């Protein structure tokens, strides 16, 4: 299994700067969300690699896909998302035709914290 890592950037990069995790990802809407993906196997710079991002509405809907060129030494791809609207997102990684990994994250308006155990999309703060 591969690994996702993240760093938040103020508009106003090295592998060690990223925080490696795929759980409880909650990002603000005023920082650029930068990710790295480290493949569990070795990869070729010429192999067809894509990411897609989907936004949750009535279930996830694909926003678009983007061709990525792997770094074959670090075995990574990297990207970033500027200006996503608040919501729930699904990032998928495809290699040579197959989806090989995916991860969810939330984007929230910078106003009132998200309580991990009690928050829901249908409460006064999130809605
Ligand atoms: Na749908
Ligand atoms: Na982008």
Residue at token pair 């197959």 = 98
State both tokens at 96. 């040579």
Spell out where the chain is interrupted, by the residue before each break (C to N > 2.5 A): 12
Ligand 2: distance of its center to the CA of 78 in Å?
A: 10
What range does the domain containing 62 cover? 3-108
**Is residue 97 in some structural domain?**
yes
Q: What CATH number corresponds to the domain at position 50? A: 2.60.40.1930
| Cα 67 off chain centre by | 15
**Is residue 125 in some structural domain?**
no
Ligand 2: distance of its center to the CA of 44 in Å?
A: 23
Separation of alpha carbons 83 and 90, rounded Å: 16
**Is residue 122 in some structural domain?**
no
What is the total count of domains within the chain? 1
C-alpha torsion sign, points 34, 66, 97, 57 = positive
- The ligand with the least distance to the CA atom of 58 is 1
Ligand 1: distance of its center to the CA of 64 in Å?
A: 14
- Which residues does residue 14 pair with via DSSP β-bridges, in sequence order? none
**Is residue 119 in some structural domain?**
no
CA dist 120 to 10, 12, 108, Å? Answer: 27, 32, 12
Resolution of the solved structure (Å): 1.7
Q: In what order do the strands lie in the sheet with 59-68?
A: 26-28, 98-108, 87-95, 49-57, 59-68
CA dist 15 to 31, 98, 126, Å? Answer: 19, 25, 33
Separation of alpha carbons 98 and 52, rounded Å: 12
List CB-based neighbours of ion ligand 1 within 5 Å: 58-59
């Amino acid at each position: 299994t591969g690994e996702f890592g993240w760093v938040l950037l103020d508009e106003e990069m090295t592998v060690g700067e990223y925080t490696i995790t795929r759980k409880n990802l909650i990002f603000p809407d005023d920082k650029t969300i930068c990710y790295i993906y480290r493949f569990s196997r070795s990869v070729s710079e010429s192999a067809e690699t894509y990411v897609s991002l989907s936004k949750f509405q009535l279930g996830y809907n694909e926003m678009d896909v983007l061709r990525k060129r792997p770094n074959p030494v670090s075995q990574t791809i990297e990207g970033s998302f500027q200006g996503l609207s608040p919501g729930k997102y699904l990032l998928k990684v495809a290699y040579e035709g197959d989806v090989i990994d995916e991860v969810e994250f939330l984007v929230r308006s910078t106003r009132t914290p998200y309580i991990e155990d009690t928050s829901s999309s249908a409460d006064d703060i999130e809605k």
